[PDB]
Design brief:
alpha/beta, homodimer, about 350 residues, TIM Barrel, N-succinylamino acid racemase (chains A, B), 7-stranded parallel sheet, O-succinylbenzoate synthase activity (chains A, B), Enolase_C-like (chains A, B)
Amino acid sequence: RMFKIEAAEIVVARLPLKTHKVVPLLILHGEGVQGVAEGTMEARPMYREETIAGALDLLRGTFLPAILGQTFANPEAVSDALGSYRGNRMARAMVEMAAWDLWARTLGVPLGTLLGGHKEQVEVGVSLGIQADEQATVDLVRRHVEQGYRRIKLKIKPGWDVQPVRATREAFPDIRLTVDANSAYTLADAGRLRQLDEYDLTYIEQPLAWDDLVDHAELARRIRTPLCLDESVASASDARKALALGAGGVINLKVARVGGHAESRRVHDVAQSFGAPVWCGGMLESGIGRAHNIHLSTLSNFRLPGDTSSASRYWERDLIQEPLEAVDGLMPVPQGPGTGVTLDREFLATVTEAQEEHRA
Amino acid sequence: RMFKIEAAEIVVARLPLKTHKVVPLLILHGEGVQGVAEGTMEARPMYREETIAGALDLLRGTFLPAILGQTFANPEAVSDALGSYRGNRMARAMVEMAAWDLWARTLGVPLGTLLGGHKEQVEVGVSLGIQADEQATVDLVRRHVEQGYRRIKLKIKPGWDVQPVRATREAFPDIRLTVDANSAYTLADAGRLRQLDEYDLTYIEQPLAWDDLVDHAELARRIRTPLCLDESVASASDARKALALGAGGVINLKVARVGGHAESRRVHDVAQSFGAPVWCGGMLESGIGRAHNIHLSTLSNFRLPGDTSSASRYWERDLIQEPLEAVDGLMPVPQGPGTGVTLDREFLATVTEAQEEHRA
């Protein structure tokens, strides 16, 4: 039956990395259980347009007042209550995703299960930064291949693209190899990007403007390597437009970017209806966001590996009690209701910069 | 020659409506003069995605530190110095537009002149809300026609659209008439919107999603009335994409929405290059924003009337010393350097709710 959201906490942690990262958490309380979600906006608008100051003000001043004391059938009804307001998808996602966790826990069911997934483990890839030269690139790839990762992603940029890809493909003829072009290119670079085609990359991620689909569709006509969209797909209708325009053939699906789990499943399903795969992108999440990502990744059109690698690669100590550690390129789905992970409140207290509680 | 920005003030006013609206102001100081601009973001993301809390945090924590104590050749150099942060165009516009005012005032030249305009007055229209019935619409339109406004814009919604338009057009066969469809339709509503075609509206403004171009292009194929885009054109490249897609034939150009005067001139010029007119949108501004709008509106492709009506329509008392009143649908360009208007500091102080100063 229905759930009443009785209280909310906003906790902002400064979590030591392996320099610190600010981790905004929302905790929703109702029906004797709690749901937790993690914001993926940054202090400044670098990856996309939202900021921690904007998002937290929107939460405390608008979204939480709208839902506190109210009773809902499901997370879709919670989202619907916020539909008047424009954009701010990652702020919306904090509420929506915490509501999924809460709802799932009222039923005692794993989150991925409720979303329709039935995988017990999910495939993971690795992301490599720019290295100094070809051999250093190949050495690091070799390490990660031996660790069992199921996809290799190389960061590239103008002046450093064909070289690391060529060297890697020569050393590893059969691996799943991709690149992240980081919106660093223009249509004038089509000829250079076309030189990647002979190395059979699975995709090139968002080479042109972060918010573009139209020019990506033109680029896709000029080169044979598939394009993968990231920042430019923030909704299921964006996904439809991207795929129908031919802007790309793959989507990097980040759950918070699109406004949460329900909209992410819609993106996933739109992509599947086009016979295009999605994969789970990463945003340097604490164990809360990482567990949400793992559960979403259990859906069947997550057919390429995700950025949900081991938590220990990022954090000295994570904010949850449960270790999220991949083995041989496979991350287990953490057991239990909802996300299947649990805040370590004593440790969280030691790294809390600010907290607040809200009621109706 | 070059100008050094020595100080910045952020002043937020709570200005009584003729219940209130928040007016965020940025004042830049340098070379013995000052430039002033007005933010068009709201407390909550209703018209678009930015908020006052997000914008002001971006100003004080990022943009102002980037420019304070620095010397610049022109407003374009100021914009360049803000860096590659994504979105947040209205926050950027506060800085950019204040820099235009400051720069113009170091030269002693009217702002519109520097942007390339040479009109001494600009044509203006008005926008009317939904009224109780057909006769109430006609009566209200008559009042405004009898003031000489050069375009009447009617708000419409399902299913109050054909009725007010038909009644108005029958009473006024020769007036310039438009509608604001307020993102209240989807492609499912094409046949109903087509019924507006016989009434010779100049355009239907943003009938579909606030952030869409692709669906608008489909809708434009199905009805003969031109579409006008507002929320979905936030840059010159968006304007190019919109016009090349056939998403609209007219653009509502809001200076802050696109990131300020230089980008607005670019949008204006892109539109002109496609044979599409622009007109100057309004955001219920104080005299600061209104004066900026009037100056921009002097450019030659502002070929349809702007939402830039009299200040006394909105405020019992404005934040500037000078009147901004239109007569017979013509708004004079306020004389003087820069925007040609001057803060009434004594009055502003009585309605200030927040004030801060920043230096290098």
